[PDB]
C-alpha cells in the first residue's frame, strides 16, 4: 500500500485494518515468532543447562516451566532426564516453520481479503456477531488448552510439588479441588498483605481443580457466543470497531501482565523456587533462620534474646499475635514454605521445635536461599548494589517480574492510546476539530 | 575596507553558517569536545587522583572521564607551557592539563555560541530571546565548573567530565553540602522539573486540539509550513483545561514567554545556590532542630535521619575521594548502624 | 420529569459546568477530597509514627516539632508491611496514628483519584470533540506516582518503604534508594534525566524561538502580549522566520518547520523519558538494580585499580551503613 492513499509509513499495519486476508497472515506470521522463540530459546537454555547446578543459577526461564509440569525432574527437582526439554524445544522450533509458511503466504500470495475467497472466514468488524462467533471458537480453544493441564496432572506424569509430603518431587494429582467455595474463594480474597489474592494458592489440588473449573466455563462460553449476539446494553455500551476491539483485548493482557509480575514474585507453589530462585520474602526469612540457628547452636537462648530496640533478635510477635521471625523480616511474616513449616505450631514458630527439631536439610537449605536472594545489577552481578564482583547472578524471579511489569505497563498505555482513538474515530473526529463546526464555539461560556 | 570583503565572506548563507562569532565558536568548541573525546579514551587519572579514567585503561562509557588535576596544583591554569607542564605535552596530560584545557575552551565556546545566536538573530531580523534564554546554561556551567572551584582549594573539586565522575559530584554535594536542603536548589528543581511539564503538557495540548486540515490520519502533513490560520484551536484548549484544572492559558504570546521564564529562571536560582557552596555557605542545618535533638534524645524527624546519612557518606567516602589528605580511619571510627 | 437519573446523567455530563465533573470525576472528587483533607490535617497535627518496624517513632507533623521543609506524613509501619490497615482495623485512632494509618488512607486515595483524573482528562476531550491522548501524556507523572507509592512497596514487602509524603523525607527516599539500588547507574534513570533535563531544554527553545518571532503589533510602551487576542483568527508569530533562524543556528535540516511535527516532539520526548524513570523505580522494585562496576579494571598483578564507579560505591556504602541504624539484626539487607 501507500501513504498518500492509506495512513503513514510508521503507522503501516493500520493500512491492514480492512484487508483480513493479509491481516490473517500478519497474525499467523507473528504467532510463529512466539513459537519460534519458545523453541529456539529452550535449546539455547538446554545447550548451556548444566544437569546439576541450580537452574536459577543458570539464567533459565523456559526449562523451569517445563520442569514444574513434571518433566525430567524427579525428587527435589533433580533434573533426571534432559530429553523432555530437547523434545519440547524443537517441536516448537518446527511448528514455527509451519505457521511461518502460513503468514508469509497469507500476507503475500494468498488473497488480501477473505470477502469472497470464503464467506465463513471473511468477517465484518461492525458485524456484532461474526465476532461473537470467532470469539466463541477461541473461547473453546483456550478451554481445551486448560484441560490439557489437568491431563498432564491427573493422567500423564503429574506435576512438580514443592509441598510434596515426602518433599519436593513429581506428584500425580488425583483429587482436584471441585466445589465453588474453595475455588472461587481466591477470587474475592484481598490482594493485600496476608490474605493474598489469586497469588495465594498453596497446593496443586486447587491449581488443578481450578483449571477443571475453567474449561467447563470457558467452553461453556465458547458455545453461548457461537450461538448468540450482544444484548441491548452490550451494544449501547461498547464501541464496535476493529481498533476498539483491539483496545479491550489490550487492557486485558496488560491487567494480566501485572497479575503475572505478582505471581512470579510471590508464589512458591506454581513456581517451585527449586527451579526458580527463592521468593524475595523467602530469602529475607532464611537469613533469620540461618542466624537463629547459628547462634542457638552456640549457646544463645533465642526465645529470650532481646535486640537493640527491645524486640528480640530472633523472635517477636506479629500484630495479630503470632510468633514470627524478628528483624526487618517482621514484614515477611506471611511467607509460607516447605523448609519452614515443620517449625510452625498453632501460635506460630514454636520454640521447642526450633530448640531441637531443626534437621540439617533445613539449616543448609536456609543457607542456600539467603545466599541466592533476588538481588543483582543489570550486568548480572548478584547481591546488594555495594557488593563487589564475582558470583554473577540474577534471580529468574527478578528477570521475570521485571520484564513483565514493563510489558504490562506499556500495554496499559497502549490500551488508552487505542481505546481513546477508536472511541473518537467513532464519533468521528480523530483527525482534527471541524473548522466549520467547532463544538466548543457553540457552548455557553463559563467565565 | 576589506573588513567588508571578509564580513561578506563570513556572513554567506552556507550549509553551516559561520559568522565572526564562529572565528571563536569553532576554534574552541571543537577543540574542547575533541579534548574530551581524547582524554576519555587515552589519558589517565592516576597521578592526579588514583583511578583509571579512560578506555585504554579498561573503563567503559559510563566509568570514563577527564578527571580534574591534583589538589597540589591549586587553581593553576595549567598552560601546557607553564611552570608545571614545562612544555612537555605528555606530562601535561598526566598532571591534569586536559581538564583546564577542556574547561577553559568549552567556556569560550559557550561565549562564542551565544554571540552566534546574537549574530544570526541580528541578520535574520528576529528578537534575541534565545541568546537571552541561553544565559541560563552559561550561569550553570560558569558557576559549577568555574566559580565553585575558585572558591575552594583547587580545581580538584570541580565536576570531572564523565558520566559517573558526575554522579560522584552529586553524592559529594549531598554528603558535604546537604544540597537537597538548599532553597536555591529546590527552585532549581521546581524549574527544570516544571519546565519539563510545560514542554510536555503544551506539546500534548497542541496535538490533541488540531483542526482537521487533511484526510488521512497522519495529520503531520495537514500543516502548511506556509502562513495562515492557527493549526490547533486555542479556543477549544483554553476550554478543556479551564474545566479540568480550573485555570487555563488564553494568550499564546504569554504562554510561550512563561515557557522561557520557568526553566531559565530555575537554572539561575540553581546557580546562585552553588555560588554559595563555593564558600561552603551552605544550607546544611536548621539550628532549632539541632538544639532540640541535642537535649531531647527521642526527637526524630526525617531531617535528622538524613543528616546521619551524610555523616556516613563523608566517613566512608572521604578517604579514597581525597587522597592528598592521607586520611586513615581505623575500623573503630567508621560510624555504622547495627549489624550492617 | 423524565426520571431524574436520566437528567442526573446529563448534569454529570454537562459540557458547560465550570469544572467538568464527569463519570470518572464522580470518584476523583470524593477520593481526592478525602486524601487532600486527611493530608492537610495529618501534616499539621499528628503523633510520631513508628515507621520502621522497631519502636522508634518519627514525628513529621508541624505541631510536633517540624517546619514545612522537615515535616511530612510518615509511612505506615513495617510491622504492618503490605497488610491493609484502614481505620476500622485499629483498636483506636491512637493505635491507627502511632502505626501510620494516615499514610495508607492518603495514598490509596490519591492514587485512585489521580487515576480517574487521568480518565477524566479523556472524557472531557471526547465531550468537546477533541482528539484524546492528552491523558496519555499525563500517564507519565501518574506512572511515577504509582511507582513510588504502590509498586515499590509491593516489591519490597511494605508501605513503610516507598516515598513518604513530605519534602525532606522525599530526600530520604532518594539518598537511601541510591545506596540500595545504585540508581544513578541505571539506564532508566539516565533516560529519566535526559527526559526531564531535555524537556526543560526544549521548553526554553520552543518558548524562546516563538517569542523571538512575534509579529510587531504593539507600541514600545505596552506589553508585547496585547498583540494577541483570545481566539484570534490566524497565527500570532512567523513560524517561518523562527525556522529561518534556528535552522541557521545549527543547520537548516537540523531544524523544525512543521508546527505539528515540532509540537509532537515536545510531548513525546519528556513523556517517553519520564515513563522510563517510572519503569526504573518499578523495575528496581524487584531488585534488578543499576550497573555494577566495582572492582573491574584490575591490574596485571591483581590489584584493583578503582574507577569513578568505586568512589561512587564508596559513598553508597556510607549510606547503606548508617540508614535505619537500629533496624538491622543480621549481615545482609534483604528488605
Amino acid at each position: 500500500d501507500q501513504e498518500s492513499s492509506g495512513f503513514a509509513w510508521w503507522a503501516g499495519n493500520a493500512r491492514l485494518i480492512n484487508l483480513s486476508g493479509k491481516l490473517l497472515g500478519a497474525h499467523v506470521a507473528h504467532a510463529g515468532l512466539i513459537v519460534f522463540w519458545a523453541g529456539a530459546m529452550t535449546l539455547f537454555e538446554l545447550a548451556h543447562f548444566i544437569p546439576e547446578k541450580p537452574m536459577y543459577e543458570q539464567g533459565l526461564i523456559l526449562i523451569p516451566h517445563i520442569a514444574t509440569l513434571g518433566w525430567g525432574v524427579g525428587p527435589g527437582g533433580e533434573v533426571v532426564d534432559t530429553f523432555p526439554f530437547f523434545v519440547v524445544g524443537v517441536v516448537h522450533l518446527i511448528s514455527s516453520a509451519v505457521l511461518g509458511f502460513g503468514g508469509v503466504y497469507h500476507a503475500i500470495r494468498g488473497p488480501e481479503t477473505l470477502e469472497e475467497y470464503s464467506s465463513f472466514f471473511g468477517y465484518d468488524w461492525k458485524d456484532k456477531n461474526k465476532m461473537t462467533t470467532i470469539l466463541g471458537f477461541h473461547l473453546i480453544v483456550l478451554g481445551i488448552g486448560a484441560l490439557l493441564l489437568v491431563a498432564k496432572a491427573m493422567f500423564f506424569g503429574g506435576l512438580y510439588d514443592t509441598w510434596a509430603p515426602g518433599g519436593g518431587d513429581v506428584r500425580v494429582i488425583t483429587n482436584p479441588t471441585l466445589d465453588p467455595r474453595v475455588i472461587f474463594g481466591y477470587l474475592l480474597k484481598s490482594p493485600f498483605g496476608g490474605e493474598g489474592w489469586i497469588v495465594s494458592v498453596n497446593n496443586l489440588e486447587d491449581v488443578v481443580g481450578g483449571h477443571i473449573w475453567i474449561g467447563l466455563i470457558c467452553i461453556a462460553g465458547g458455545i453461548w457466543h457461537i450461538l448468540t449476539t450482544p444484548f441491548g446494553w452490550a451494544r449501547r455500551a461498547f464501541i464496535w470497531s476493529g481498533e476498539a476491539y483491539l483496545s479491550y483485548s489490550l487492557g486485558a493482557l496488560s491487567m494480566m501482565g501485572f497479575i503475572a509480575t505478582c505471581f512470579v514474585w510471590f508464589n512458591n507453589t506454581v513456581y517451585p523456587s527449586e527451579f526458580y530462585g527463592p521468593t524475595g520474602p523467602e530469602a529475607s526469612q532464611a537469613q533469620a533462620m540461618t542466624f537463629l540457628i547459628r547462634d542457638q547452636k552456640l549457646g544463645a537462648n533465642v526465645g529470650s534474646a532481646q535486640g537493640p530496640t527491645g524486640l528480640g533478635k530472633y523472635l517477636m510477635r506479629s500484630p495479630t499475635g503470632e510468633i514470627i521471625f524478628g528483624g526487618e523480616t517482621m514484614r515477611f511474616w506471611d511467607f509460607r514454605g516447605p523448609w519452614l513449616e515443620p517449625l510452625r505450631g498453632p501460635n506460630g514458630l514454636d520454640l521447642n521445635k526450633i530448640k531441637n527439631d531443626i534437621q540439617p536439610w533445613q539449616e543448609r537449605r536456609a543457607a542456600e536461599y539467603m545466599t541466592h536472594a533476588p538481588l543483582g545489577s543489570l550486568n548480572s552481578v548478584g547481591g546488594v548494589a555495594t557488593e563487589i564482583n564475582s558470583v554473577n547472578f540474577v534471580s529468574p524471579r527478578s528477570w521475570l517480574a521485571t520484564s513483565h511489569f514493563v510489558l504490562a505497563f506499556f500495554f496499559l498505555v497502549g490500551h488508552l492510546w487505542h481505546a481513546g482513538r477508536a472511541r473518537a474515530a467513532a464519533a468521528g473526529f480523530e483527525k482534527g476539530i471541524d473548522r466549520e463546526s467547532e463544538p466548543v464555539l457553540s457552548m455557553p461560556s463559563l467565565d | 575596507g576589506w573588513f567588508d570583503i571578509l564580513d561578506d565572506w563570513l556572513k554567506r548563507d552556507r550549509f553551516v553558517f559561520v559568522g565572526w562569532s564562529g572565528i571563536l565558536l569553532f576554534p574552541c568548541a571543537y577543540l574542547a569536545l575533541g579534548g574530551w573525546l581524547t582524554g576519555t579514551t587515552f589519558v589517565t587519572s592516576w597521578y592526579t587522583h588514583g583511578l583509571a579514567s579512560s578506555y585504554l585503561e579498561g573503563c567503559n562509557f559510563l566509568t570514563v572521564a577527564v578527571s580534574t588535576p591534583a589538589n597540589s596544583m591549586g587553581h593553576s591554569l595549567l598552560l601546557l607551557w607553564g611552570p608545571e607542564a614545562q612544555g612537555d605535552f605528555t606530562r601535561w596530560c598526566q598532571l591534569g592539563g586536559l581538564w583546564t584545557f577542556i574547561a577553559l575552551h568549552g567556556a569560550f565556546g559557550l561565549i562564542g555560541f551565544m554571540l552566534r545566536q546574537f549574530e544570526i538573530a541580528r541578520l535574520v531580523g528576529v528578537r534575541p530571546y534565545n541568546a537571552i534564554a541561553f544565559s541560563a546554561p552559561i550561569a550553570v556551567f560558569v558557576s559549577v565548573f568555574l566559580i565553585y572551584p575558585l572558591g575552594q582549594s583547587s580545581w580538584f573539586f570541580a565536576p570531572s567530565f564523565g558520566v559517573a565522575a558526575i554522579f560522584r559530584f552529586l553524592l559529594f554535594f549531598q554528603g558535604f553540602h546537604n544540597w537537597t536542603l538548599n532553597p536555591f536548589h529546590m527552585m532549581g528543581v521546581a524549574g527544570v522539573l516544571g519546565g519539563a511539564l510545560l514542554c510536555a503538557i503544551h506539546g500534548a495540548t497542541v496535538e490533541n486540539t488540531l483542526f482537521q486540515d487533511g484526510e488521512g490520519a497522519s495529520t503531520f502533513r495537514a500543516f502548511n509550513p506556509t502562513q495562515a490560520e492557527e493549526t490547533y484551536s486555542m479556543v477549544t484548549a483554553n476550554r478543556f483545561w479551564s474545566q479540568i484544572f480550573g485555570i487555563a492559558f488564553s494568550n499564546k504570546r504569554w504562554l510561550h514567554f512563561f515557557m522561557l521564564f520557568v526553566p531559565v529562571t530555575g537554572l539561575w536560582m540553581s546557580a546562585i545556590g552553588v555560588v554559595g557552596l563555593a564558600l561552603n555557605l551552605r544550607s546544611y542545618d536548621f539550628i532549632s532542630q539541632e538544639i532540640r535533638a541535642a537535649e531531647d534524645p527521642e526527637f526524630e524527624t526525617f531531617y535528622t535521619k538524613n543528616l546521619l546519612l551524610n555523616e556516613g557518606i563523608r566517613a566512608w567516602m572521604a578517604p579514597q575521594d581525597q587522597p592528598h589528605e592521607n586520611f586513615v580511619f581505623p575500623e573503630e571510627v567508621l560510624p555504622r548502624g547495627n549489624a550492617l | 420529569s423524565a426520571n431524574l437519573w436520566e437528567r442526573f446523567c446529563n448534569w454529570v455530563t454537562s459540557t458547560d459546568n465550570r469544572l467538568y465533573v464527569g463519570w470518572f470525576g464522580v470518584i476523583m472528587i470524593p477520593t481526592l477530597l478525602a486524601a487532600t483533607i486527611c493530608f492537610v490535617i495529618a501534616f499539621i497535627a499528628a503523633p510520631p509514627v513508628d515507621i520502621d518496624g522497631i519502636r522508634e517513632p518519627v514525628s513529621g507533623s508541624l505541631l510536633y516539632g517540624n517546619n514545612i521543609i522537615t515535616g511530612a506524613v510518615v509511612p505506615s509501619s513495617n510491622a504492618i508491611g503490605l497488610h491493609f490497615y484502614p481505620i476500622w482495623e485499629a483498636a483506636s485512632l491512637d493505635e491507627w496514628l502511632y502505626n501510620g494509618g494516615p499514610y495508607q488512607l492518603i495514598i490509596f486515595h490519591f492514587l485512585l483519584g489521580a487515576s480517574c483524573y487521568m480518565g477524566r482528562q479523556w472524557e472531557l476531550s471526547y465531550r468537546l470533540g477533541m482528539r484524546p491522548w492528552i491523558c496519555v501524556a499525563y500517564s507519565a507523572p501518574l506512572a511515577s506516582a504509582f511507582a513510588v507509592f504502590l509498586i515499590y512497596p509491593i516489591g519490597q514487602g511494605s508501605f513503610s518503604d516507598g516515598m513518604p509524603l513530605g519534602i525532606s523525607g522525599t530526600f530520604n527516599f532518594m539518598i537511601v534508594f541510591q545506596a540500595e539500588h545504585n540508581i544513578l547507574m541505571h539506564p532508566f534513570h539516565q533516560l529519566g534525566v535526559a527526559g526531564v533535563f531535555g524537556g526543560a531544554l526544549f521548553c526554553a527553545m520552543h518558548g524562546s524561538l516563538v517569542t523571538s518571532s512575534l509579529i510587531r503589533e504593539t507600541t514600545e510602551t505596552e506589553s508585547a502580549n496585547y498583540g494577541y487576542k483570545f481566539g484570534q483568527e490566524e497565527e500570532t508569530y512567523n513560524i517561518v522566520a523562527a525556522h529561518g533562524y534556528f535552522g541557521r543556528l545549527i543547520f537548516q535540516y537540523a531544524s523544525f518547520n512543521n508546527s505539528r511535527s515540532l509540537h509532537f516532539f515536545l510531548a513525546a520526548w519528556p513523556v517517553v523519558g519520564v515513563w522510563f524513570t517510572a519503569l526504573g523505580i518499578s523495575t528496581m522494585a524487584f531488585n534488578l538494580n543499576g550497573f555494577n562496576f566495582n572492582h573491574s579494571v584490575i591490574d596485571a598483578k591483581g590489584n584493583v585499580i578503582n574507577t569513578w564507579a568505586d568512589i561512587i560505591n564508596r559513598a553508597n556504602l556510607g549510606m547503606e551503613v548508617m540508614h535505619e541504624r537500629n533496624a538491622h539484626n543480621f549481615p545482609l539487607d534483604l528488605a
Binding site: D447 | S242, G246 | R18, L62, F230, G231
Partner: peptide, 30 residues
C-alpha cells in the same frame, strides 16, 4: 508561632486558588 505562620501562608495559597479560578476575568472571544 511558626506552626501558625506556616498554616497561614498555606491558607492563603488556598484562598488564592479559589479566587484565581472562580473570580478570574473571563476569557471573552475577541
Amino acid at each position: 508561632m511558626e506552626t501558625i505562620t506556616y498554616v497561614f501562608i498555606f491558607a492563603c495559597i488556598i484562598a488564592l486558588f479559589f479566587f484565581a479560578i472562580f473570580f478570574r476575568e473571563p476569557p471573552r472571544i475577541t
